[PDB]
């Protein structure tokens, strides 16, 4: 009985129970059975992607077999899971494993009721150059009963039959696929007592639902049975630790924290501190963003939609930041990331001046099949696979070549971002920002520092001249970055010096910062041009103030309360010591 | 070589048998084989012969399965096999249809008369080949007959495009469609005209799935490279798993809808590839294989006509203007391409009335799209809101596309704010300044 | 010490025997055998010598089989063997033909004795190699004599192409064609003029099957890939699947028709290879084998001449007009290529007279190709439907293509819908107004 | 070997052992042995467990060599072995360090 030395008697296990319940797979089972009930080509296959119930089906049919819920032909049949050592026990001496394979088929073929094999991984037999290379040992007898149910993913399947050509003329593919979200829940429910027993915890029914929905909207690279079950099992393990520490899987908190840990995506965590969350961010940003509350609110609005689920699952929120050059809109994208992730450097960004029709799409998403370089994902999906929710930033997107600009439509809506190798990324809870200086021409009208009605349409005009309407009409919001003028820049300078103090290495020296009109004007006069915007306010602060005082610090001429003043372009700040 | 000297003496009469290319790998790697054996080519039987074969085998199947097989069944299998199972030779393909159909009878009986006929087989074939035609579900003819109204409920107007497609479908269902000529269309007109949208709805209608579609974006093409994106490369060059866009899709879903976006932007060599597809369907593949996509429906789109459709010479495009559209087509695509299009269809410019209807449908789609049944409108301004959207979105050169954007910006962003600030719970309504705005339906509900 | 130390002393005189490939795999690895054995070259004999050998062996065959063999039969076999069995060295090949021919007689002998004449030998060669010309199918002269007729009933117009091809066939059948120059044609003409249609109908005629053709989409041939696509890669590179599209077909179907679709698009590197194939015939494989295509008919197609044919200067293309076309083919292709073509044929315009006949053919083929060859037409309106189609389908500069499309647009599209609605069994009819339309069968079916 | 299965019904109890790798070979080679024997996994001890083992054997080595062993030395042997002898399992690796070290002490002591 060679079979008993290599295979697992699934029937015996089923006879003894020790199997999971099988949920919703009745039709895959019916099809499997129907093929097995055939006169000749009774060789069905369970085919799809990993983690979709392919072996569940077998436990299922094993149970149907035990209970005679099968056709006459199968009523008394038995089933064995083989593979494994059948191909490797014969580690030495030519023809040894071949003899086993044959002996097994002989054992199966003769007399002993109807025996059905289950091949878990038919691709492992493959037919490695045929010429007696394992899989090739079968075909001679595929008509001679020796019924067998196979299993393989579509990639594996395609590889086998393309290279072989006979198996696809001998076997009956049965599509096996992930369940709907509700069906997934039913599955999770069916396995619920298994996990509850092994971990000693309860699972809320709503946790099963959350895991099913979450998996569908969280893990694009894992099929629902495994994906949702892992969310359940991983969560159960976490709960078991809590149980042991001194419980159940909490739909909201166990699963959300587990998910937050596993991947991130702020939306899946959603903090309960509503009094401040999604409120305070505008104030935090206001300090960074002086005057331009309009941009803050535009962003904050999208952020608020993603939280609590108002945002559309297939529409990553996205903005186009138009405006006065030097407006500070890039830092805004980082400061938003600051709030969103408690990480200003979470983002992925692309220098769009590097883009050309000759290569840009591949620089962004990676090259395709047969071409040099497999840096799949290029600048972008290469990184999305690690941080699906990171903020995306397109520096000077206005300079991006129009073809790659068009590819970026995927970020804006119908979020099926793909990779050059024919793979799918899928973005949802991912805020995307693109930048342009087109609004500068209208902001520079100076008709109030705030861009006004009508003039903002002139901006849209400039935008239509550079961006296709196909892009523009799909942006969550197009935001215009206004003139800061003297009032904002006086505040920006006071603020920049403050914010620098807080981050100026250590608070050992401290500042007075009494700029007085002299230094406020220096920074606001020889700095903030409308076309350089705030860029020079920071540069003069660093080039003249932080630098000269730093040099005095290095000489140990400064001990306490540093001040700022000017010579009176010769002003150049030029600050005294503070020893 | 044990057989070698033996066979050379005329002893051990040996009868061999193998595959064309297996043979190649033997004799061209041996020489002696060619000397030792006399190859005899075995022909593939004609359809007529195939039926005779099936008939001859019929009693073996009837006995095994416990079923009766009618002669029309035998014929049906041979006919369907030649047309719908191009990757398997007739002696098997026809038997597979008979054998499986018979098994279907056996299964049906045991799952709870036994006469196999043409419908038995046709349904079976559909299950195995995916060809919907052969389901022969005549009670569903209502949809096929009225698919024009069904498509018109999703897209507005553009009836000529709807009718053109409807006939592709009806011809296929009737079996009258030319067995070698995939349906082919070239959709011309303004962006926002519904060209792509229609193709999606066709895929929708045929398989109840807009993602059933296989999309090829012609803007990614380059005549120096891109042919291989569709059909792959040949043996030797880096990469394989060939033809991600066409070969590797068409061998799995022959009955799918192909969509080639912006074919006017395709570089000429790709347009040249299309010629196989649009003629006979025998699209070759880089690894020396064939596709035979005659069961396919192919839609291509182009904006060349934008030049004349925006002449605004009637919303429904008239002669001369339409012919100028064809002018642009003829001055761009070679006639070799154009002559393979079943119908070149020029879309109409949307009328204000169409825009109104589009707004209604589009709002319907948006409302239906929500996964949470709080997220909806009552609108109020039952005409007025829609007229705002039309007045402010009726573009003679962007069509309906701005209706989508207008709604997203003036209505949905206001909704986003309202969700964010909890100013809206459900059943939202619309009002207008001077500048459409939304009303507040706060945490009262 | 297998043999070696003894051989080195003049002990054990050994006579060896091996092929070049074997020799190389032994000697280049062993070293000592290179000196132990004293290599003697044995050349393959001439045909004359082969026949002498056959004469000597003739009595061994006559006695074994109990047949009588004619000396001319022996000559015939040696000549045939050289020409049709290039993969097997002449002594063997000649004997195979004699022995098998005798066996042919022997099989008949047991069921009925005879002699083995030249005609018998020729049949045998055809039995083993296809090469229909050796069947000496004199009773089929009728077809060869009238194949022009038959082709003209499939293809309207293009009489020059038909005559040209027919002559290739006749020369091959008559044994007049040059064993080293596979007949080849280059068809220039308007799209829709029937270039590939003729080629397929020829394969149809020759093998009773259009699918027999070794179709090569030569238009899909960029420089770096194109040759290997057809010949396969050489040793030491990914994919040792020798032959790509051509070797793998030519070695099995040596008497086949090759078709190159739009050779004008093929990169010149391809054409460069084809130069040998088209003349001399020794196309070789990427692995170093010689195939020999000389028993094939090669048809190449292109559209360069379309630019002048569209001038309407004659139905049959006129002098000068033809030269404009030849100008273009000479400008585009190297003369090295053009000179090797057996003939360049410029297709005629499919005149309105032609469309009248074409309409008939297409309507018939449409019925013939139905799977459900039940649902035939009655048409009615023989003259009016014919005229409607003849007029509306006459887009002369698109050849017959528009017609096919017209019929599809006016008849089949409607038919399909009527079928979905069960309004038609068969004997479908057409009405016309002013616009051609279909009627219904009141009796649904 | 046939005597075993043949007579195995009469109790004749046998206890045996095999390496994980060898078990695989036993099963594949005979079959009946898998059916007749109860496979038992035997665990590798943790460092903590290993030290307890070493302590039990400590007096054997002290006596055998005539030297003393510090308790921290036993701990060290097990801990050190876990980090620097990845090719040898702890039940042995720790002892190798103890026995070799004890010998090193006795060896040097009892040299010329
Ligand atoms: N009804 C079910 N019965 C058993 N397992 C199920 C069922 N539904 C989902 N599963 C999950 O699927 C797994 C096996 O099913 P599935 O076939 O999807 O995996 P698989 O891909 O077949 O396994 P493999 O990678 O070997 O093809 C189980 O381990 C379980 O987690
Ligand atoms: N309205 C604003 N929005 C954001 N940041 C601003 C604004 N006004 C001033 N800033 C400040 O300006 C600086 C950011 O400048 P940034 O590098 O974004 O210039 P930019 O205008 O984005 O250049 P680009 O024309 O490529 O977008 C920051 O220090 C930021 O605090
Ligand atoms: N006639 C119509 N009925 C309903 N919706 C329409 C219509 N025309 C356009 N639309 C809207 O336009 C959008 C897609 O339109 P369309 O197919 O015109 O894009 P497109 O212009 O084809 O893109 P492309 O210019 O690449 O083909 C859809 O969201 C759809 O709602
Ligand atoms: N003279 C004719 N007689 C019968 N059928 C014809 C004729 N001319 C064209 N056809 C029809 O046209 C189709 C193929 O035509 P044709 O050879 O003109 O294609 P083609 O234009 O050569 O393609 P290509 O422009 O690449 O050569 C066939 O289906 C055939 O029925």
Swiss-Prot record, chains B, C:
The modification Phosphoserine is found at residue 8. Changing residue 196 to A: Reduces ATP hydrolysis, but does not affect oligomerization. There is a cross-link at residue 195 (Glycyl lysine isopeptide (Lys-Gly) (interchain with G-Cter in ubiquitin)). Changing residue 36 to M: Reduces ATPase activity by 80%. Impairs oligomerization. A motif (Nuclear localization signal) lies at residues 348-364. ATP 2 binds at residues 189-196. Induction: By heat stress dependent on the heat shock transcription factor HSF1 and the general stress transcription factors MSN2 and MSN4. Expressed at a higher level in respiring cells than in fermenting cells. Expressed in stationary phase cells and spores (at protein level). Belongs to the ClpA/ClpB family. Has 2 AAA ATPase type nucleotide-binding domains (NBDs) per monomer, a low-affinity, high-turnover site (NBD1) and a high-affinity site (NBD2) with a 300-fold slower rate of hydrolysis. There is allosteric regulation between the 2 sites. ATP binding to NBD1 triggers binding of polypeptides and stimulates ATP hydrolysis at NBD2. Nucleotide binding to NBD2 is crucial for oligomerization. Present with 32800 molecules/cell in log phase SD medium. This is Heat shock protein 104. The chain holds residues 299 to 884 of 908 of the full protein.
